[PDB]
Amino acid sequence: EDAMTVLTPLTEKDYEGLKRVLRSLQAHKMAWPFLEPVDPNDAPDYYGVIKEPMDLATMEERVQRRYYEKLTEFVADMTKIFDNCRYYNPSDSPFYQCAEVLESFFVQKLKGFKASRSH
Ligand SMILES: COC(=O)C1CCN(C(=O)NC(C)(C)C)CC1
């Protein structure tokens, strides 16, 4: 990550862009596994092996409350969604596949956001 991602405080204008990025991911066809916290009745061992769970509804709550102070912190929570999924599930599972697709989409949208901050 470059300097302004790490170092620049998020302004109110930045927050309007973060809301747009988040809603784009929530609307993606492959986002279904990640919209809400993992249901323990689906996977009784999940919360014993994943130390720091994350999901898009938790990120929405955090955006609304202005939890994030730097872009790096927002990127770190999003990356945790995908890394948790690739650690828990095998590489041939549809869950793992969805993480691959949605992370690529996030990177496209994140590049767009970064370009819009400065010029
Ligand atoms: C992002 O979601 C996940 O990583 C969980 C979601 C719940 N899940 C399953 O329903 N898989 C079983 C039934 C085969 C255990 C495990 C993976």
JSON list of C-alpha atoms and ligand atoms in Angstrom, two decimals:
[
{"chain": "A", "resi": 1, "resn": "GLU", "atom": "CA", "xyz": [0.00, 0.00, 0.00]},
{"chain": "A", "resi": 2, "resn": "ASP", "atom": "CA", "xyz": [1.19, 3.55, -0.80]},
{"chain": "A", "resi": 3, "resn": "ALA", "atom": "CA", "xyz": [1.53, 6.39, 1.75]},
{"chain": "A", "resi": 4, "resn": "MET", "atom": "CA", "xyz": [-1.86, 8.11, 1.42]},
{"chain": "A", "resi": 5, "resn": "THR", "atom": "CA", "xyz": [-3.69, 4.74, 1.98]},
{"chain": "A", "resi": 6, "resn": "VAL", "atom": "CA", "xyz": [-1.84, 4.14, 5.25]},
{"chain": "A", "resi": 7, "resn": "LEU", "atom": "CA", "xyz": [-1.52, 7.75, 6.47]},
{"chain": "A", "resi": 8, "resn": "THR", "atom": "CA", "xyz": [-4.37, 9.96, 5.31]},
{"chain": "A", "resi": 9, "resn": "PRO", "atom": "CA", "xyz": [-7.37, 10.30, 7.65]},
{"chain": "A", "resi": 10, "resn": "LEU", "atom": "CA", "xyz": [-10.71, 9.33, 6.11]},
{"chain": "A", "resi": 11, "resn": "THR", "atom": "CA", "xyz": [-12.81, 12.47, 5.44]},
{"chain": "A", "resi": 12, "resn": "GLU", "atom": "CA", "xyz": [-16.62, 12.63, 5.09]},
{"chain": "A", "resi": 13, "resn": "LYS", "atom": "CA", "xyz": [-16.16, 12.62, 1.28]},
{"chain": "A", "resi": 14, "resn": "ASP", "atom": "CA", "xyz": [-14.01, 9.47, 1.62]},
{"chain": "A", "resi": 15, "resn": "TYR", "atom": "CA", "xyz": [-16.87, 7.88, 3.67]},
{"chain": "A", "resi": 16, "resn": "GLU", "atom": "CA", "xyz": [-19.39, 8.46, 0.86]},
{"chain": "A", "resi": 17, "resn": "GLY", "atom": "CA", "xyz": [-17.02, 6.47, -1.41]},
{"chain": "A", "resi": 18, "resn": "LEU", "atom": "CA", "xyz": [-16.58, 3.66, 1.15]},
{"chain": "A", "resi": 19, "resn": "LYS", "atom": "CA", "xyz": [-20.37, 3.30, 1.41]},
{"chain": "A", "resi": 20, "resn": "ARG", "atom": "CA", "xyz": [-20.57, 2.94, -2.38]},
{"chain": "A", "resi": 21, "resn": "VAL", "atom": "CA", "xyz": [-17.81, 0.28, -2.42]},
{"chain": "A", "resi": 22, "resn": "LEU", "atom": "CA", "xyz": [-19.50, -1.70, 0.34]},
{"chain": "A", "resi": 23, "resn": "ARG", "atom": "CA", "xyz": [-22.94, -1.64, -1.36]},
{"chain": "A", "resi": 24, "resn": "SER", "atom": "CA", "xyz": [-21.38, -2.83, -4.65]},
{"chain": "A", "resi": 25, "resn": "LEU", "atom": "CA", "xyz": [-19.97, -5.90, -2.88]},
{"chain": "A", "resi": 26, "resn": "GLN", "atom": "CA", "xyz": [-23.27, -6.56, -1.03]},
{"chain": "A", "resi": 27, "resn": "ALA", "atom": "CA", "xyz": [-25.03, -6.57, -4.48]},
{"chain": "A", "resi": 28, "resn": "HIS", "atom": "CA", "xyz": [-22.57, -9.02, -6.16]},
{"chain": "A", "resi": 29, "resn": "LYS", "atom": "CA", "xyz": [-24.03, -12.47, -7.02]},
{"chain": "A", "resi": 30, "resn": "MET", "atom": "CA", "xyz": [-21.13, -14.32, -5.30]},
{"chain": "A", "resi": 31, "resn": "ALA", "atom": "CA", "xyz": [-21.40, -12.29, -2.01]},
{"chain": "A", "resi": 32, "resn": "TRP", "atom": "CA", "xyz": [-24.08, -14.59, -0.52]},
{"chain": "A", "resi": 33, "resn": "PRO", "atom": "CA", "xyz": [-21.69, -16.48, 1.86]},
{"chain": "A", "resi": 34, "resn": "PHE", "atom": "CA", "xyz": [-20.39, -13.20, 3.39]},
{"chain": "A", "resi": 35, "resn": "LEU", "atom": "CA", "xyz": [-23.46, -10.95, 3.89]},
{"chain": "A", "resi": 36, "resn": "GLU", "atom": "CA", "xyz": [-24.04, -11.92, 7.56]},
{"chain": "A", "resi": 37, "resn": "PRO", "atom": "CA", "xyz": [-21.98, -13.66, 10.31]},
{"chain": "A", "resi": 38, "resn": "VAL", "atom": "CA", "xyz": [-21.38, -17.42, 9.86]},
{"chain": "A", "resi": 39, "resn": "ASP", "atom": "CA", "xyz": [-24.27, -19.37, 11.47]},
{"chain": "A", "resi": 40, "resn": "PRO", "atom": "CA", "xyz": [-22.83, -21.75, 14.12]},
{"chain": "A", "resi": 41, "resn": "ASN", "atom": "CA", "xyz": [-25.66, -24.29, 13.43]},
{"chain": "A", "resi": 42, "resn": "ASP", "atom": "CA", "xyz": [-24.23, -24.63, 9.85]},
{"chain": "A", "resi": 43, "resn": "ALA", "atom": "CA", "xyz": [-20.66, -25.16, 11.13]},
{"chain": "A", "resi": 44, "resn": "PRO", "atom": "CA", "xyz": [-20.40, -26.02, 14.90]},
{"chain": "A", "resi": 45, "resn": "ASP", "atom": "CA", "xyz": [-16.55, -25.88, 14.88]},
{"chain": "A", "resi": 46, "resn": "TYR", "atom": "CA", "xyz": [-16.17, -22.60, 12.88]},
{"chain": "A", "resi": 47, "resn": "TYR", "atom": "CA", "xyz": [-15.73, -20.25, 15.87]},
{"chain": "A", "resi": 48, "resn": "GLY", "atom": "CA", "xyz": [-13.16, -22.57, 17.52]},
{"chain": "A", "resi": 49, "resn": "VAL", "atom": "CA", "xyz": [-10.79, -22.39, 14.51]},
{"chain": "A", "resi": 50, "resn": "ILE", "atom": "CA", "xyz": [-11.36, -18.81, 13.17]},
{"chain": "A", "resi": 51, "resn": "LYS", "atom": "CA", "xyz": [-9.96, -16.38, 15.75]},
{"chain": "A", "resi": 52, "resn": "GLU", "atom": "CA", "xyz": [-11.23, -13.09, 14.21]},
{"chain": "A", "resi": 53, "resn": "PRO", "atom": "CA", "xyz": [-14.50, -13.61, 12.23]},
{"chain": "A", "resi": 54, "resn": "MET", "atom": "CA", "xyz": [-15.68, -10.87, 9.84]},
{"chain": "A", "resi": 55, "resn": "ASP", "atom": "CA", "xyz": [-18.66, -10.30, 7.50]},
{"chain": "A", "resi": 56, "resn": "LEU", "atom": "CA", "xyz": [-20.20, -7.50, 5.40]},
{"chain": "A", "resi": 57, "resn": "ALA", "atom": "CA", "xyz": [-22.99, -6.64, 7.92]},
{"chain": "A", "resi": 58, "resn": "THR", "atom": "CA", "xyz": [-20.37, -6.08, 10.65]},
{"chain": "A", "resi": 59, "resn": "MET", "atom": "CA", "xyz": [-18.44, -3.86, 8.18]},
{"chain": "A", "resi": 60, "resn": "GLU", "atom": "CA", "xyz": [-21.65, -1.88, 7.41]},
{"chain": "A", "resi": 61, "resn": "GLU", "atom": "CA", "xyz": [-22.22, -1.25, 11.15]},
{"chain": "A", "resi": 62, "resn": "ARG", "atom": "CA", "xyz": [-18.57, -0.08, 11.43]},
{"chain": "A", "resi": 63, "resn": "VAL", "atom": "CA", "xyz": [-18.88, 2.26, 8.37]},
{"chain": "A", "resi": 64, "resn": "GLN", "atom": "CA", "xyz": [-22.12, 3.79, 9.77]},
{"chain": "A", "resi": 65, "resn": "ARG", "atom": "CA", "xyz": [-20.45, 4.40, 13.18]},
{"chain": "A", "resi": 66, "resn": "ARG", "atom": "CA", "xyz": [-17.28, 5.88, 11.50]},
{"chain": "A", "resi": 67, "resn": "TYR", "atom": "CA", "xyz": [-15.09, 3.17, 13.10]},
{"chain": "A", "resi": 68, "resn": "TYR", "atom": "CA", "xyz": [-12.39, 3.35, 10.39]},
{"chain": "A", "resi": 69, "resn": "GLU", "atom": "CA", "xyz": [-9.85, 6.22, 10.61]},
{"chain": "A", "resi": 70, "resn": "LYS", "atom": "CA", "xyz": [-7.56, 5.13, 7.73]},
{"chain": "A", "resi": 71, "resn": "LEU", "atom": "CA", "xyz": [-8.20, 3.28, 4.44]},
{"chain": "A", "resi": 72, "resn": "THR", "atom": "CA", "xyz": [-5.75, 0.54, 5.52]},
{"chain": "A", "resi": 73, "resn": "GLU", "atom": "CA", "xyz": [-8.10, -0.41, 8.41]},
{"chain": "A", "resi": 74, "resn": "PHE", "atom": "CA", "xyz": [-11.11, -0.83, 6.04]},
{"chain": "A", "resi": 75, "resn": "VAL", "atom": "CA", "xyz": [-8.97, -2.92, 3.63]},
{"chain": "A", "resi": 76, "resn": "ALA", "atom": "CA", "xyz": [-7.76, -5.10, 6.56]},
{"chain": "A", "resi": 77, "resn": "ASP", "atom": "CA", "xyz": [-11.34, -6.00, 7.67]},
{"chain": "A", "resi": 78, "resn": "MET", "atom": "CA", "xyz": [-12.36, -6.80, 4.05]},
{"chain": "A", "resi": 79, "resn": "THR", "atom": "CA", "xyz": [-9.25, -8.95, 3.50]},
{"chain": "A", "resi": 80, "resn": "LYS", "atom": "CA", "xyz": [-10.03, -10.88, 6.73]},
{"chain": "A", "resi": 81, "resn": "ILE", "atom": "CA", "xyz": [-13.40, -11.98, 5.22]},
{"chain": "A", "resi": 82, "resn": "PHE", "atom": "CA", "xyz": [-11.58, -13.62, 2.26]},
{"chain": "A", "resi": 83, "resn": "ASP", "atom": "CA", "xyz": [-8.59, -14.99, 4.23]},
{"chain": "A", "resi": 84, "resn": "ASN", "atom": "CA", "xyz": [-10.87, -16.59, 6.86]},
{"chain": "A", "resi": 85, "resn": "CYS", "atom": "CA", "xyz": [-12.81, -18.31, 4.05]},
{"chain": "A", "resi": 86, "resn": "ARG", "atom": "CA", "xyz": [-9.70, -19.69, 2.27]},
{"chain": "A", "resi": 87, "resn": "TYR", "atom": "CA", "xyz": [-8.28, -21.01, 5.60]},
{"chain": "A", "resi": 88, "resn": "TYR", "atom": "CA", "xyz": [-11.50, -22.71, 6.77]},
{"chain": "A", "resi": 89, "resn": "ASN", "atom": "CA", "xyz": [-12.65, -24.27, 3.46]},
{"chain": "A", "resi": 90, "resn": "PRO", "atom": "CA", "xyz": [-10.78, -26.50, 0.96]},
{"chain": "A", "resi": 91, "resn": "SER", "atom": "CA", "xyz": [-9.70, -25.10, -2.43]},
{"chain": "A", "resi": 92, "resn": "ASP", "atom": "CA", "xyz": [-12.38, -27.09, -4.36]},
{"chain": "A", "resi": 93, "resn": "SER", "atom": "CA", "xyz": [-15.36, -25.82, -2.28]},
{"chain": "A", "resi": 94, "resn": "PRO", "atom": "CA", "xyz": [-17.83, -23.23, -3.69]},
{"chain": "A", "resi": 95, "resn": "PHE", "atom": "CA", "xyz": [-17.14, -21.05, -0.60]},
{"chain": "A", "resi": 96, "resn": "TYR", "atom": "CA", "xyz": [-13.42, -20.83, -1.53]},
{"chain": "A", "resi": 97, "resn": "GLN", "atom": "CA", "xyz": [-14.37, -20.03, -5.19]},
{"chain": "A", "resi": 98, "resn": "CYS", "atom": "CA", "xyz": [-16.66, -17.18, -4.07]},
{"chain": "A", "resi": 99, "resn": "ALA", "atom": "CA", "xyz": [-13.79, -15.65, -2.02]},
{"chain": "A", "resi": 100, "resn": "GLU", "atom": "CA", "xyz": [-11.56, -15.69, -5.16]},
{"chain": "A", "resi": 101, "resn": "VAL", "atom": "CA", "xyz": [-14.22, -13.94, -7.29]},
{"chain": "A", "resi": 102, "resn": "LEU", "atom": "CA", "xyz": [-15.32, -11.38, -4.70]},
{"chain": "A", "resi": 103, "resn": "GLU", "atom": "CA", "xyz": [-11.74, -10.40, -3.72]},
{"chain": "A", "resi": 104, "resn": "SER", "atom": "CA", "xyz": [-10.92, -9.69, -7.43]},
{"chain": "A", "resi": 105, "resn": "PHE", "atom": "CA", "xyz": [-14.07, -7.50, -7.61]},
{"chain": "A", "resi": 106, "resn": "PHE", "atom": "CA", "xyz": [-13.07, -5.69, -4.38]},
{"chain": "A", "resi": 107, "resn": "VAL", "atom": "CA", "xyz": [-9.60, -4.91, -5.82]},
{"chain": "A", "resi": 108, "resn": "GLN", "atom": "CA", "xyz": [-11.21, -3.42, -8.98]},
{"chain": "A", "resi": 109, "resn": "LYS", "atom": "CA", "xyz": [-13.50, -1.20, -6.85]},
{"chain": "A", "resi": 110, "resn": "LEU", "atom": "CA", "xyz": [-10.69, -0.26, -4.40]},
{"chain": "A", "resi": 111, "resn": "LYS", "atom": "CA", "xyz": [-8.48, 0.97, -7.29]},
{"chain": "A", "resi": 112, "resn": "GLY", "atom": "CA", "xyz": [-11.44, 3.10, -8.47]},
{"chain": "A", "resi": 113, "resn": "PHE", "atom": "CA", "xyz": [-11.88, 4.58, -4.96]},
{"chain": "A", "resi": 114, "resn": "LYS", "atom": "CA", "xyz": [-8.15, 5.39, -4.62]},
{"chain": "A", "resi": 115, "resn": "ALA", "atom": "CA", "xyz": [-8.13, 7.19, -8.00]},
{"chain": "A", "resi": 116, "resn": "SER", "atom": "CA", "xyz": [-11.15, 9.31, -6.95]},
{"chain": "A", "resi": 117, "resn": "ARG", "atom": "CA", "xyz": [-9.60, 10.50, -3.63]},
{"chain": "A", "resi": 118, "resn": "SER", "atom": "CA", "xyz": [-6.75, 12.62, -5.00]},
{"chain": "A", "resi": 119, "resn": "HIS", "atom": "CA", "xyz": [-7.63, 14.28, -8.34]},
{"chain": "B", "resi": 1, "resn": "LIG", "atom": "C1", "xyz": [-18.25, -17.81, 4.71]},
{"chain": "B", "resi": 1, "resn": "LIG", "atom": "O1", "xyz": [-18.88, -19.01, 5.22]},
{"chain": "B", "resi": 1, "resn": "LIG", "atom": "C2", "xyz": [-18.08, -19.99, 5.62]},
{"chain": "B", "resi": 1, "resn": "LIG", "atom": "O2", "xyz": [-16.88, -19.97, 5.49]},
{"chain": "B", "resi": 1, "resn": "LIG", "atom": "C3", "xyz": [-18.84, -21.13, 6.25]},
{"chain": "B", "resi": 1, "resn": "LIG", "atom": "C4", "xyz": [-20.35, -21.07, 6.04]},
{"chain": "B", "resi": 1, "resn": "LIG", "atom": "C5", "xyz": [-21.06, -22.30, 6.59]},
{"chain": "B", "resi": 1, "resn": "LIG", "atom": "N1", "xyz": [-20.49, -23.52, 6.03]},
{"chain": "B", "resi": 1, "resn": "LIG", "atom": "C6", "xyz": [-21.28, -24.57, 5.57]},
{"chain": "B", "resi": 1, "resn": "LIG", "atom": "O3", "xyz": [-22.50, -24.46, 5.49]},
{"chain": "B", "resi": 1, "resn": "LIG", "atom": "N2", "xyz": [-20.66, -25.70, 5.29]},
{"chain": "B", "resi": 1, "resn": "LIG", "atom": "C7", "xyz": [-20.94, -27.06, 5.83]},
{"chain": "B", "resi": 1, "resn": "LIG", "atom": "C8", "xyz": [-22.44, -27.30, 5.98]},
{"chain": "B", "resi": 1, "resn": "LIG", "atom": "C9", "xyz": [-20.36, -28.11, 4.88]},
{"chain": "B", "resi": 1, "resn": "LIG", "atom": "C10", "xyz": [-20.27, -27.16, 7.19]},
{"chain": "B", "resi": 1, "resn": "LIG", "atom": "C11", "xyz": [-19.06, -23.63, 6.34]},
{"chain": "B", "resi": 1, "resn": "LIG", "atom": "C12", "xyz": [-18.31, -22.47, 5.74]}
]
